[PDB]
Design an enzyme around this catalytic site. Structure first.
Site, PDB file in Angstrom:
ATOM      1  N   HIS A  61       0.937  -1.895  -0.529  1.00  0.00           N
ATOM      2  CA  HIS A  61      -0.638   0.065  -0.119  1.00  0.00           C
ATOM      3  C   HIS A  61       0.723   0.909   0.604  1.00  0.00           C
ATOM      4  O   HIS A  61       0.401   2.218  -0.904  1.00  0.00           O
ATOM      5  CB  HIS A  61      -1.329  -0.104   1.028  1.00  0.00           C
ATOM      6  CG  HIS A  61      -1.772  -1.381   1.195  1.00  0.00           C
ATOM      7  ND1 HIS A  61      -3.273  -1.089   0.181  1.00  0.00           N
ATOM      8  CD2 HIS A  61      -1.812  -2.294   2.181  1.00  0.00           C
ATOM      9  CE1 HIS A  61      -3.466  -2.418   0.789  1.00  0.00           C
ATOM     10  NE2 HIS A  61      -2.638  -3.370   1.524  1.00  0.00           N
ATOM     11  N   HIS A  91       4.951   6.995   6.987  1.00  0.00           N
ATOM     12  CA  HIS A  91       5.546   6.348   5.452  1.00  0.00           C
ATOM     13  C   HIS A  91       4.998   7.784   4.773  1.00  0.00           C
ATOM     14  O   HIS A  91       4.311   8.129   5.271  1.00  0.00           O
ATOM     15  CB  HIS A  91       4.006   5.042   5.156  1.00  0.00           C
ATOM     16  CG  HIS A  91       3.673   5.988   6.437  1.00  0.00           C
ATOM     17  ND1 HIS A  91       2.783   5.797   7.537  1.00  0.00           N
ATOM     18  CD2 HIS A  91       1.863   6.458   5.765  1.00  0.00           C
ATOM     19  CE1 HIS A  91       2.085   5.870   7.593  1.00  0.00           C
ATOM     20  NE2 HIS A  91       0.989   6.481   6.778  1.00  0.00           N
ATOM     21  N   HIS A  93       2.000   9.295   1.536  1.00  0.00           N
ATOM     22  CA  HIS A  93       0.833   8.795   0.329  1.00  0.00           C
ATOM     23  C   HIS A  93       1.243  10.263  -0.885  1.00  0.00           C
ATOM     24  O   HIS A  93       1.828  10.971  -0.037  1.00  0.00           O
ATOM     25  CB  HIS A  93      -0.299   9.366   1.010  1.00  0.00           C
ATOM     26  CG  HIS A  93      -0.939   8.492   2.308  1.00  0.00           C
ATOM     27  ND1 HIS A  93      -1.469   7.296   2.547  1.00  0.00           N
ATOM     28  CD2 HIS A  93      -0.406   8.760   3.562  1.00  0.00           C
ATOM     29  CE1 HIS A  93      -1.387   6.988   4.080  1.00  0.00           C
ATOM     30  NE2 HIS A  93      -0.806   7.208   4.463  1.00  0.00           N
ATOM     31  N   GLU A 103      -3.054  12.763   2.032  1.00  0.00           N
ATOM     32  CA  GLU A 103      -4.776  12.902   2.691  1.00  0.00           C
ATOM     33  C   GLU A 103      -5.437  14.217   2.992  1.00  0.00           C
ATOM     34  O   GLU A 103      -6.432  15.030   2.628  1.00  0.00           O
ATOM     35  CB  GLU A 103      -4.659  11.899   3.264  1.00  0.00           C
ATOM     36  CG  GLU A 103      -3.651  10.648   3.000  1.00  0.00           C
ATOM     37  CD  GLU A 103      -3.863   9.512   3.093  1.00  0.00           C
ATOM     38  OE1 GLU A 103      -3.576   9.080   4.918  1.00  0.00           O
ATOM     39  OE2 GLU A 103      -4.359   8.613   3.023  1.00  0.00           O
ATOM     40  N   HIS A 116       3.566  11.389   6.749  1.00  0.00           N
ATOM     41  CA  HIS A 116       2.582  10.421   8.159  1.00  0.00           C
ATOM     42  C   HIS A 116       3.499   9.572   9.488  1.00  0.00           C
ATOM     43  O   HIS A 116       4.505   8.515   8.997  1.00  0.00           O
ATOM     44  CB  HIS A 116       1.276  10.035   8.294  1.00  0.00           C
ATOM     45  CG  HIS A 116       0.839   9.980   7.768  1.00  0.00           C
ATOM     46  ND1 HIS A 116      -0.367   9.512   7.021  1.00  0.00           N
ATOM     47  CD2 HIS A 116       0.120  11.471   7.489  1.00  0.00           C
ATOM     48  CE1 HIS A 116      -1.183  10.382   6.672  1.00  0.00           C
ATOM     49  NE2 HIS A 116      -0.932  11.536   6.622  1.00  0.00           N
ATOM     50  N   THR A 195      -5.973   6.330   8.258  1.00  0.00           N
ATOM     51  CA  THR A 195      -6.548   6.760   7.596  1.00  0.00           C
ATOM     52  C   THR A 195      -6.603   5.425   5.769  1.00  0.00           C
ATOM     53  O   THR A 195      -7.336   5.300   5.060  1.00  0.00           O
ATOM     54  CB  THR A 195      -6.120   7.959   6.271  1.00  0.00           C
ATOM     55  OG1 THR A 195      -4.290   7.412   6.210  1.00  0.00           O
ATOM     56  CG2 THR A 195      -5.570   9.290   6.770  1.00  0.00           C
TER      57      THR A 195
HETATM   58  N1  LIG Z   1      -2.274   5.722   7.409  1.00  0.00           N
HETATM   59  S1  LIG Z   1      -2.423   6.636   9.310  1.00  0.00           S
HETATM   60  O1  LIG Z   1      -3.574   6.884   9.627  1.00  0.00           O
HETATM   61  O2  LIG Z   1      -0.938   7.487   9.626  1.00  0.00           O
HETATM   62  C1  LIG Z   1      -2.372   4.765   9.602  1.00  0.00           C
HETATM   63  C2  LIG Z   1      -2.723   3.305   9.129  1.00  0.00           C
HETATM   64  C3  LIG Z   1      -2.325   2.840   9.519  1.00  0.00           C
HETATM   65  C4  LIG Z   1      -1.459   2.263  10.925  1.00  0.00           C
HETATM   66  C5  LIG Z   1      -1.229   0.576  11.354  1.00  0.00           C
HETATM   67  N2  LIG Z   1      -1.624   0.002  10.889  1.00  0.00           N
HETATM   68  C6  LIG Z   1      -3.029  -0.424  11.006  1.00  0.00           C
HETATM   69  N3  LIG Z   1      -3.094  -0.793  12.817  1.00  0.00           N
HETATM   70  C7  LIG Z   1      -4.413  -1.483  13.843  1.00  0.00           C
HETATM   71  N4  LIG Z   1      -4.338  -2.523  12.625  1.00  0.00           N
HETATM   72  C8  LIG Z   1      -4.293  -3.259  11.483  1.00  0.00           C
HETATM   73  O3  LIG Z   1      -4.949  -3.659  11.385  1.00  0.00           O
HETATM   74  C9  LIG Z   1      -2.615  -2.164  10.688  1.00  0.00           C
HETATM   75  N5  LIG Z   1      -3.014  -2.275   9.530  1.00  0.00           N
HETATM   76  O4  LIG Z   1      -3.607  -3.721   8.940  1.00  0.00           O
HETATM   77  O5  LIG Z   1      -1.781  -2.100   8.680  1.00  0.00           O
HETATM   78  C10 LIG Z   1      -0.865   3.123  10.994  1.00  0.00           C
HETATM   79  C11 LIG Z   1      -0.884   4.567  10.492  1.00  0.00           C
HETATM   80 ZN   LIG Z   2      -0.290   7.594   6.662  1.00  0.00          ZN
END
Ligand SMILES: NS(=O)(=O)c1ccc(CNc2nc[nH]c(=O)c2[N+](=O)[O-])cc1
Ligand SMILES: [Zn+2]
Ligand SMILES: NS(=O)(=O)c1ccc(CNc2nc[nH]c(=O)c2[N+](=O)[O-])cc1
Length: 257
Positions: A61, A91, A93, A103, A116, A195
């Protein structure tokens, strides 16, 4: 599986993750005129001097730069936060074009990308437990515009060809995330969510006002990554951003002005 392709993108996620249409989803448009200055907000404290990166992973992703979070080393505190949040990964986007990719938006303005820096509340002992709590995570959001190169980004850009496809990882030590910060730590903040699926409503969002500049060549390199695994049909890793979601019953606060 969810993704960002023609048939499994953001408008589809609600069918597996009903919280997609919840009360505190992210990202949101930041309406600068209506965000109220909150003089009770504190300066953000970013303490990354002891950060220990370990690895970089293409997870299909985005790519994540992972940190050793087994000790209180790279922490975010102050700002709107109570307590201490430990850096676990960062990471980005980004878009297929420089005109889109972030985003969060700022008066509907889309930046070319958005970084992020993801942190979890140490009172919950670990990441997996933190994401179950409404104040479990703090994500520091930083816009990228295309212009002058960011020298502190180049080590990340240079390793991407080693992790082109989903499930590839590469050793990624001694990377200093301070090289990714803008000069000002003025911010907006609001309660929101991850997100990406599972879209958990566990995030205090802190979104810096000042974007960082990266070169066209830098962001071009992000766009050479692949959503697919090795020896699958090539799908460039581009437009891996969720659009702005309804603000609903939330206020965005400004630390400034
Ligand atoms: N885009 S963001 O909002 O910064 C962001 C989005 C996802 C994460 C952590 N991912 C996960 N977190 C919890 N359960 C899960 O199952 C997963 N997963 O499956 O990835 C951390 C940050
Ligand atoms: Zn993110
Ligand atoms: N609610 S969700 O988790 O986003 C989710 C959304 C859609 C699916 C079905 N995916 C697909 N279906 C048909 N063609 C495709 O090309 C893809 N595809 O692209 O995967 C599976 C899960």
């Amino acid at each position: 599986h969810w993704g960002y392709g023609k048939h499994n993108g953001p408008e589809h996620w609600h069918k597996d993750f009903p919280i997609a249409k919840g009360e505190r989803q992210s990202p949101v448009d930041i309406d600068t005129h209506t965000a109220k200055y909150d003089p009770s907000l504190k300066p953000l404290s970013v303490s990354y001097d002891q950060a220990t990166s370990l690895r970089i992973l293409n997870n299909g992703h985005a790519f994540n730069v992972e940190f050793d979070d087994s000790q209180d080393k790279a922490v975010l505190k102050g700002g709107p936060l109570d307590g201490t949040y430990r850096l676990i990964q960062f990471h980005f986007h980004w878009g297929s074009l420089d005109g889109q990719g972030s985003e969060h938006t700022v008066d509907k303005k889309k930046y070319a990308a958005e970084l992020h820096l993801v942190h979890w509340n140490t009172k919950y002992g670990d990441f997996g437990k933190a994401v179950q709590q409404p104040d479990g995570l703090a994500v520091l959001g930083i816009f990228l515009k295309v212009g002058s190169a960011k020298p502190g980004l180049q080590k990340v850009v240079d390793v991407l060809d080693s992790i082109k496809t989903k499930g590839k990882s590469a050793d990624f030590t001694n990377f200093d995330p301070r090289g990714l910060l803008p000069e000002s730590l003025d911010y907006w903040t609001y309660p929101g969510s991850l997100t990406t699926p599972p879209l958990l409503e566990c995030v205090t969002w802190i979104v810096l006002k000042e974007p960082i500049s990266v070169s066209s060549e830098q962001v071009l390199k992000f766009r050479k990554l692949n959503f697919n695994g090795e020896g699958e049909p090539e799908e460039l890793m581009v437009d891996n951003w969720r659009p702005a979601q309804p603000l609903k019953n939330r206020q965005i606060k400004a630390s400034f002005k």
